């Protein structure tokens, strides 16, 4: 999917923002954690739209948020 | 442990005074959760808005959640 412009993000409803950001976040997370990509994307969609949008423009920040999300899920695993 | 900060004191303190007051009380609570990394975790909390750091002193569950989140941010910053 082509990137969302900053002008489109401010023009979308919260429902439209979630669908547009969620589809692009899922594809990028799928390249890092394919099995937990739907679960991690749902965690990302709880952030503010501006915060989730920065993940689509900074690869290094997206990797750290995925690593952070995996660590939080691992922390709750009473292994 | 220090006595809790009242909401009226927080609004009357300067930004530097808020850091000292919140930082001392946040450190004592985080120390009971992560004693070794408590100073670094407290510094991460002091970058939040004063109202948000104050809620961590009044909500135990959210405090534990933010510490776990802060610990996971530190793990993500590993060079190796």
Author numbering:
A (entry chain B): 482 to 560
B (entry chain A): 481 to 560
Give the text the authors published on this PDB structure:
In further work, we were able to solve the crystal structures of PABP1(J) and of PABP1(J) co-crystallized with a synthetic eIF4E4 PAM2 peptide, both to a resolution of ∼2 Å. Obtaining these structures enabled us to locate the binding motif for eIF4E4 in relation to the three-dimensional structure of Leishmania PABP1. Consistent with the structures of other analogous complexes, binding is associated with relatively minor changes in the conformation of the PABP1 fragment; the side chains of only Lys 520 and Glu 527 are affected. Our results suggest that the changes in the roles of the respective translation factors in Leishmania have created a biomolecular chain that functions without poly(A)-mediated modulation of protein-protein interactions. This outcome is consistent with the observation that the PABP1 PABC domain forms a stable fold in solution that is only minimally altered by binding of the eIF4E4 peptide. The 1H–15N-HSQC NMR spectra showed PABP1(J) to be folded, while eIF4E4(iv) displayed amide resonance chemical shift dispersion characteristic of an intrinsically disordered domain.
NMR and X-ray crystallography reveal that Leishmania has a unique type of N-terminally-extended cap-binding protein (eIF4E4) that binds via a PAM2 motif to PABP1. Exceptionally, therefore, by binding tightly to two protein ligands and to the mRNA 5′ cap4 structure, the trypanosomatid N-terminally extended form of eIF4E acts as the core molecular scaffold for the mRNA-cap-binding complex. Thus, in Leishmania, the chain of interactions 5′cap4-eIF4E4–PABP1-poly(A) bridges the mRNA 5′ and 3′ ends. Finally, the eIF4E4 N-terminal extension is an intrinsically disordered region that transitions to a partly folded form upon binding to PABP1, whereby this interaction is not modulated by poly(A) binding to PABP1.
